[PDB]
Write a protein that binds this ligand. Structure first.
Ligand code: HEM
Ligand code: HEM
Ligand code: 231
Ligand code: 231
Lengths: 395, 395
């Protein structure tokens, strides 16, 4: 007989409140959206981590959602549609392993470490441009967005003319209020691929195209498009989010930033605590139960859809002492900001490198940077980062 | 019996299509929104102009909305709430003239003429910053937004720290999908006033504070807040919109732009044709009939709410031959982009000067400027301007 959390991003977004309520309403909660869409969420660290590692019980892939294939839910509802896709993240077992295996090389810790000089160069160029500006600056537009999109652009083989197009596209797909986002994103990326087949390069999209051409069985056309999409979705928006979130947190905890700036504390650990404390991905659709599952005296029936509550789990007092305190010296937090199990973030080492470069460089160039104005949230209950991040670079 | 036009901006906005449908469906049409709200719209030039000039028959102000108090529409509906306010634009008669009169001085021809040096200076500084950038630039973020908000900031006495806050706040109020936008905007502006009382200055907000202090009957506290909000709503968003829309139009009509650049056509007339052709305000809530009014053989009952269709009226073939063609040489269009009658845009001369400075200066500095990427629309059925306007300055 579960508690219910009613969500509507049109009536504002409040991630801190949402995280609190999802955690408070036991580990297993019902989440009701607009339309007549109600689903489950798992929101405490221990049950969530357990579910995320047990893919025979909690499977990926919309074909497993009973109510969806039984016409009880509208397939065009944005939330029902968001992970109604054919990429690796919406697969389990051999299909996941096949697809993830094809692209893993490009994202290994060691490959990512070879990207450091170029990431430093892109970071330093951005800082140079910021130094030419004089008064209030949107950190998101100047810094947080351009850095990760440039980095993933070079890895994937994207074109600079599409960077702003992609920013809009991804926001729409993650809004959970845009019925046509997936369809428009698919047609967009299909065109990218068809342009790229004409003019190959040494980027990952070209390599995946080349891999399909060599062996059609290795990767279908639908998988090529959807996996390209997934890499685009993941590739910049969350790192962008995290840069802004991290700067907000460090400047609102000036003592901790002081430790970082004087070499008395670890940037790496601080970034892990930022990931836990203000996780850019609050929750995502879905896990689907393969059988009846009982948690805390509540049974989730076989075939039901379950939101993955990374954000509430990251504030769980069972997992962390004093969870609602930001503390960069805390024992390296084993957080779920990058998820857990088979679908643990492909890009996790790349994001960690990006943040490790971007965050100290910013404060080195602009030691007296301050937060000004308001930073209203992106209107989505799925993601947690600001629409804008106004700063003053010089006192 | 009137036709009905169903609008839902969540399912994607298309102002060109929307204007065509509104115009085509005779001058008097019903417009239905999601939830429980259906209203009227006047969408041809001649009946609209006539309504707008006749304030004893078509009054402003939500207390005149019979259906509202008859509980026939959802109150808290964003569209019902948008002009549920106490500013000059939501009043008629003595109250309108009192409130409008307090601020008119600052917007007369002679006052606006003294703003020219500063507008040119702001324009030239923005162009200097753009010249230090390299590849694709968002013209909106670099030029179209910062110019008007800086200009109105100086006139009103706003703080640069709030500029980006205001951009979001205004977008929310004009979305017509945000129930909490007016309330949050009022709270925000009430704080502005409380800050401003401490430190008065030479700007219009201070003058309105000073006016209330000297004679409380000249201006209530509610009126002070709502009118400050109104001036902020009006003060930059539409000029910003018009800059981008005008650049789109001139670069997609390169022959006409050529004539302007060689002194074979008038910038002033071109700007009037931009205003007519891609009017930034498509329609707004609410004339309310003071009696039964018959137009085109259709009676609008007393007390009913009527959308003001500036944009469809501006494409009316009865008002202009070949309305759907952009033609900077046409006789100066007598358009409704600024409205008509007692509420004719207080800022109209300021907007015309801003555009007259901004548009030629842009093309003089960046003669080979080119449109690239996508420019998706702001998601509102009320306003007509892009979310982003990617350009290459020095292709
Ligand atoms: C830096 C570039 C990034 C890329 C290219 C990227 C890409 C991906 C991909 C492809 C997956 C799916 C993995 C699989 O199915 O095996 C994934 C999962 C995930 N990523 Fe990322 N990601 C990046 C950064 C981030 C960051 C900074 C965060 C969080 C702050 C994040 C959060 C997640 C989460 C939570 C999942 C698991 C989703 C789930 O279990 O349903 N990612 N990422
Ligand atoms: C191109 C730029 C602009 C456009 C297209 C525009 C359009 C309009 C329109 C259509 C109206 C009439 C609304 C109605 O009748 O319901 C109006 C009224 C108004 N506008 Fe603007 N406007 C612009 C710029 C500005 C500026 C720069 C200001 C500066 C404060 C401003 C302040 C006002 C005010 C205060 C009113 C209400 C006047 C009254 O109630 O008497 N506008 N504008
Ligand atoms: C849908 C698909 C992938 C993501 C993602 C992966 N990594 C970051 N974000 C978010 C939403
Ligand atoms: C609501 C109220 C006023 C406006 C306006 C007036 N002038 C510019 N914008 C827009 C929307």
């Amino acid at each position: 007989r579960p508690h219910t959390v009613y969500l509507d991003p049109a009536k504002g977004v409040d991630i801190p409140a949402q995280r609190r309520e999802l955690l408070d309403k036991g580990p297993v909660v019902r989440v009701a959206f607009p339309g007549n869409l109600e689903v489950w969420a798992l929101t405490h660290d221990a049950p969530l981590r357990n579910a995320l590692a047990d893919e025979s019980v909690f499977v990926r892939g919309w074909r497993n959602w009973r109510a969806l294939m039984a016409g009880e839910v509208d397939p065009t509802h944005p939330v029902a549609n968001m992970l109604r896709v054919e990429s690796m993240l919406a697969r389990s077992g051999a299909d996941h392993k096949r697809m993830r295996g094809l692209v893993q090389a490009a994202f290994t810790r060691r490959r990512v470490e070879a990207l450091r000089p170029r990431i430093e160069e892109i970071t330093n160029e951005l800082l140079d441009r910021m130094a030419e500006s004089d008064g209030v600056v949107d950190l998101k537009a100047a810094y947080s967005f351009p850095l990760p999109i440039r980095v993933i652009s070079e890895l994937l083989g994207l074109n600079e003319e599409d960077h702003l197009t992609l920013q809009t596209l991804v926001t729409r797909t993650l809004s959970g209020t845009d019925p046509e986002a997936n369809a428009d994103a698919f047609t967009f990326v299909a065109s990218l691929i068809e342009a790229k087949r004409k003019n190959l390069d040494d980027g990952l999209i070209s390599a995946m195209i080349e891999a399909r051409a060599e062996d059609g069985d290795r990767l279908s056309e639908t998988e090529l498009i959807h996996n390209t999409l997934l890499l685009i979705i993941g590739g910049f928006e969350t790192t962008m989010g995290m840069i802004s979130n991290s700067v907000q947190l460090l400047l609102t905890h000036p003592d901790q930033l002081h430790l970082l700036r004087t070499g008395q504390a670890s940037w790496e650990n601080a970034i892990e605590e930022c990931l836990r404390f203000e996780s850019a991905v609050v929750m995502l659709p879905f896990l689907y139960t393969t059988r009846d599952v009982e948690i805390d005296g509540i049974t989730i029936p076989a075939g039901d859809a379950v939101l993955i509550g990374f954000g509430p789990a990251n504030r769980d007092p069972q997992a962390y002492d004093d969870p609602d305190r930001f503390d960069i010296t805390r024992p390296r937090p084993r957080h779920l900001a990058f998820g857990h199990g088979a679908h643990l973030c492909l890009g996790a080492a790349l994001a960690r490198l990006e943040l490790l470069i971007a965050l100290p460089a910013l404060f080195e160039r602009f030691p007296d940077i301050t937060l000004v104005g308001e930073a209203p949230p992106t209107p989505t209950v799925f993601m947690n980062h600001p629409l804008s991040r106004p700063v003053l670079l010089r006192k």
